[PDB]
């Protein structure tokens with residue numbers, strides 16, 4: 001899969017993108033790789049933050065579906081017109097597919113100034129697609145129309161501009177050069193988000209000792225479209241307390257722990273060893289088994305080069321509170337080669353050949369851990385009448 005290695009780019013904190021082509025003849029666009037959503041949607045009209053956009057009129061193969069799509073979310077919205085066209089990934093499999101494409105005609109707080117992407121590739125399942133689950137997601141179309149195996153894998157690798165990031169999206173396979181050691185699999189609990197189950201959390205080898213359902217309240221997901229590790233409020237508070245205690249030789253402002261302020265040390269003097277490792281134990285394929293993924297402060301403290309003090313190494317705390325469950329975002333994923341094995345309803349983790357570490361500690365994937373009488377750590381989201389009324393033909 002050499003042709004697919006190093007096919008991802010981006011700016012730190014602004015998401016990883018892949019080059020794609022849309023239409024005939026092919027129009028090149030940079031597309032955000034998002035395992036936390038399920039639409040393929042591209043800028044299709046001028047916008048202050050877009051150097052270019054999908055020109056439907058320039059494509060001989062474009063078909064209008066005569067249907068709009070409106071997608072509000074917490075931080076903003078995008079909307080536009082549904083259609084189909086021919087799509088390929090130049091540094092991906094040598095295939096071309098007819099996929100659904102949402103042509104984004106209006107948006108608010110969606111595009112990011114300087115991120116260098118013009119669209120989004122939702123890699124999650126039909127259940128969370130807009131306007132509804134009848135709009136086939138891109139990967140579903142790719143698998144159905146071609147011989148591409150139903151699996152993809154992601155290796156995300158962590159003064160005037162933001163730091164450039166790189167990585168690999170391997171479509172249809174696993175590239176053994178992208179990881180070392182064992183590849184461990186956790187079940188996909190349900191196919192909507194890439195939902196998983198966390199059974200235990202440790203901070204510097206110390207158990208947080210919470211009811212494990214708290215770790216998955218109201219879900220836990222693997223999301224390339226979230227920068228941070230995000231934790232449910234109660235879990236976040238417990239984690240911050242534990243990380244504070246370990247790093248107590250340093251008194252940081254409240255702003256730091258809120259992710260609203262950088263902390264700095266003189267170049268190359270960052271005291272990494274005062275910050276603890278964080279271990280998330282994930283449910284194994286076997287009953288009563290788990291494995292752990294362990295990340296370093298090199299993952300949860302994001303480097304940000306300050307113009308005023310380029311003399312110093314400065315960092316943002318990249319663990320944050322959630323009210324919508326655990327989000328294993330780029331913070332987690334940058335430690336690991338992550339296999340989205342849709343065919344076998346499981347997600348694989350192995351130590352990434354590109355993860356940032358020091359000579360003392362490393363990001364790790366370790367198991368098995370067995371528990372005599374393992375509890376169900378899954379949370380069951382209260383069923384609304386809205387949701388219950390939906391017919392699923």
Ligand SMILES: CN1C(=O)[C@]2(N=C1N)c1cc(-c3cccnc3F)ccc1O[C@H]1CCOC[C@@H]12
Pocket residue numbers: 013014015016032034035036037071072073075110111223224225226227
């Ligand atoms: C949480 N999350 C988002 O808000 C979302 N992708 C994820 N995963 C998303 C993430 C980003 C995004 C921002 C920074 C870093 N990485 C990213 F990817 C930008 C826009 C965006 O649009 C949302 C449109 C509605 O669906 C979700 C989409």
Ligand code: NI
Pocket residue numbers: 391392393
């Ligand atoms: Ni019906």
